[PDB]
Amino acid sequence: GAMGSMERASLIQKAKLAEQAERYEDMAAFMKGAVEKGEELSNEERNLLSVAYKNVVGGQRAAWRVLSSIEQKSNEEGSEEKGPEVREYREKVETELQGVCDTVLGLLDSHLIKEAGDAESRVFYLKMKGDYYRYLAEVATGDDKKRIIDSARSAYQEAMDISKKEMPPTHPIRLGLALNFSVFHYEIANSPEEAISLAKTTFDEAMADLHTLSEDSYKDSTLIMQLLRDNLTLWT
Amino acid sequence: GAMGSMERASLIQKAKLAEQAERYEDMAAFMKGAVEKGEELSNEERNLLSVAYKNVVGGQRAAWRVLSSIEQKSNEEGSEEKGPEVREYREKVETELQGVCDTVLGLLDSHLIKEAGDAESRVFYLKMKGDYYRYLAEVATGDDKKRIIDSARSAYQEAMDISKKEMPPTHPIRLGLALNFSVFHYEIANSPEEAISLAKTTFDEAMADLHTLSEDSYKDSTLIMQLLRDNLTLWT
Amino acid sequence: RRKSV
Amino acid sequence: RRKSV
Ligand SMILES: COC[C@H]1CC[C@@H]2/C1=C\[C@]1(C)C(=C([C@H](C)COC(C)=O)C[C@@H]1O)[C@@H](O)[C@H](O)[C@@H]2C
Ligand SMILES: COC[C@H]1CC[C@@H]2/C1=C\[C@]1(C)C(=C([C@H](C)COC(C)=O)C[C@@H]1O)[C@@H](O)[C@H](O)[C@@H]2C
Ligand SMILES: [Cl-]
Ligand SMILES: [Cl-]
Ligand SMILES: [Mg+2]
Ligand SMILES: [Mg+2]
Ligand SMILES: [Mg+2]
Ligand SMILES: [Mg+2]
Numbered sequence A, B: 001g002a003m004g005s006m007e008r009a010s011l012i013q014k015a016k017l018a019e020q021a022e023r024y025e026d027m028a029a030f031m032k033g034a035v036e037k038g039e040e041l042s043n044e045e046r047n048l049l050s051v052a053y054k055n056v057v058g059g060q061r062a063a064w065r066v067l068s069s070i071e072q073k074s075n076e077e078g079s080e081e082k083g084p085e086v087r088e089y090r091e092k093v094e095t096e097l098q099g100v101c102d103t104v105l106g107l108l109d110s111h112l113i114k115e116a117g118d119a120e121s122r123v124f125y126l127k128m129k130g131d132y133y134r135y136l137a138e139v140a141t142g143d144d145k146k147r148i149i150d151s152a153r154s155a156y157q158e159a160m161d162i163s164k165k166e167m168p169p170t171h172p173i174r175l176g177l178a179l180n181f182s183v184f185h186y187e188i189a190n191s192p193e194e195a196i197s198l199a200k201t202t203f204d205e206a207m208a209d210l211h212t213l214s215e216d217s218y219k220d221s222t223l224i225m226q227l228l229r230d231n232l233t234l235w236t
Numbered sequence C, D: 001r002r003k004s005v
């Protein structure tokens, strides 16, 4: 419950309709229900799961940043005292964002990761685990900040090790994972040199493998390679 | 509750922050809380109330249309039978949309309209009443459809009568009300001739009054006059 | 799409 | 803004 009474296939069908309607909260709730059926997810289903939550949490993160910026300006010299409301409402949004991250991490831990044996599924779920600890790290300010950062790092690193052993350098999941791990280094771990080196090496190793691909695979890989390039251009 | 324990001024301040963060559901919930304090709303507060709900319901309406279109295609000749899911999920979105409209109509009836004595507030709230019955009319398919359409009509008409007596022809609320009443005629009441005549007369009566206005008021009125013109161009 | 406000 | 995916 509340998706307990709906057929797994109906949850998946509804998740696709919610995506078409840009109803990402519904899409995420339907995919949560589908995972909770206990069966492993197909490639297409892992994509739906990831898209639903990435959109939900992306909206909360963009809102948190807006409110954080306002709260920071309220704490500058000569800003007029406006009471607790800005902090309260930033905390409300922050708490809801944390709940979403905790829900995704819960799904991964119970029991997506442990039943994921193929590289494409294992690396995908570990990247999500890195990503959702990373979003928790974006808002973390207390005793646990270091441990949350290290949980993001450890998950990304385990996914990196598997992807390097088991997937070609042009695999979209390999390239997406490196893109995100490189962002983690740059803006969470205060290691811009590592972020740059990772984005560079990843781009160049994929460049050299392009010649093995079909036209369609070439399009898939070069799309994410351009995101690596956009970040290198921004950072250098 | 759940906004019962928050100060009215804090609800208003948070509504403005939610607007900046594009968090329209929160903005609407904060404005509902503010109305439920029982005091009348200022001009600026009526704007926040209207903006919050117009955005919430606009997202639900756009989603309903996406799903309705899909459901219609599923009912065409030679479409494959895909089960009840499309209809169920369209009904879910439709029910939630109806609940939002009922909540706004509830606020207007308890007790915004009855305490609104000035033309600018009375006409504003009656336009909202017309608008939310109109959204209910967009989805209505049964025994009550005619009564829901007539409730939209009666509210728009009472607002039209007051606005014509009490407000200049260039007033943004007068112009917005006519724009929406003209849309009601065109696509709800199957009276495109009435919609056209209303948009024309409204535009021309405002044109002739522009010369009385300051530069800023001129900008305000001409903005909504252009929406009247866009509809006339579409419909003729 | 027709305009409303 | 930097890209992630
Ligand atoms: C857990 O991380 C998932 C993330 C890693 C890289 C990428 C991811 C997500 C989604 C599902 C895809 C794209 C492509 C960039 C664009 O879509 C297309 C046409 O391929 C963006 C989407 O969010 C998939 O398609 C990719 O194959 C691949 C799984
Ligand atoms: C109940 O119907 C409210 C609706 C009637 C016309 C218009 C309405 C809504 C809002 C609040 C406004 C605009 C302007 C078109 C754009 O904003 C500016 C800069 O004026 C779009 C906003 O939704 C107000 O500003 C207008 O003064 C006026 C109250
Ligand atoms: Cl709050
Ligand atoms: Cl449903
Ligand atoms: Mg079953
Ligand atoms: Mg001062
Ligand atoms: Mg906190
Ligand atoms: Mg397995």
Ligand SMILES: [Mg+2]
Pocket: B007, B008
């Ligand atoms: Mg008080």
Ligand SMILES: [Mg+2]
Pocket: B078, B079, B080
């Ligand atoms: Mg067939």
Ligand SMILES: [Mg+2]
Pocket: B091, B094, B095
């Ligand atoms: Mg219904």
Ligand SMILES: [Mg+2]
Pocket: B040, B115, B116, B117, B118
């Ligand atoms: Mg009064």
